[PDB]
Amino acid sequence: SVLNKWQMNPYDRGSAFAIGSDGLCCQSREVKEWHGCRATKGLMKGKHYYEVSCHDQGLCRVGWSTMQASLDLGTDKFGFGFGGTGKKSHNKQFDNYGEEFTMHDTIGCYLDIDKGHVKFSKNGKDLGLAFEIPPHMKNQALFPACVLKNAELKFNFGEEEFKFPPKDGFVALSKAPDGYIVKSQHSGNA
**What does the alpha-carbon distance between residue 109 and residue 91 come to, in Å, rounded to a whole number?**
19
Cβ–Cβ under 8 Å, residues 168 and 78 = no
Question: Where does residue 81 rank: exposed (0-12), middle (13-18), buried (19+ CB within 10 A)?
Answer: buried
Using DSSP, state whether 59 is helix, strand or coil.
strand
Q: How far apart are the first and last CA of the chain?
A: 8
> Which of 152, 154, 153 lies closest to 29 in space, CA to CA?
152
Q: Resolution, in Å, please?
A: 2.0
CB atoms within 10 A of CB 53: 17
- Distance separating alpha carbons of residues 27 and 148, to the nearest angstrom: 7
Which residues have a Cβ under 8 Å from the Cβ of 175 and sit 6 or more positions away? Answer: 158
Residue closest to 44 by CA, chosen among 110, 91, 112, 107:
112
On whether the 1-190 domain is CATH 2.40.50.140, my answer is no
Bridge partners for 65 per DSSP: 79, 143
Within a 10 A sphere around the Cβ of 23, how many other Cβ atoms? 19
- Kind of pairing, strands 125-132 and 79-83? unpaired
User: Nearest Cα to 155, choosing from 35, 24, 57?
Assistant: 24
Solving technique for this entry?
Answer: X-ray
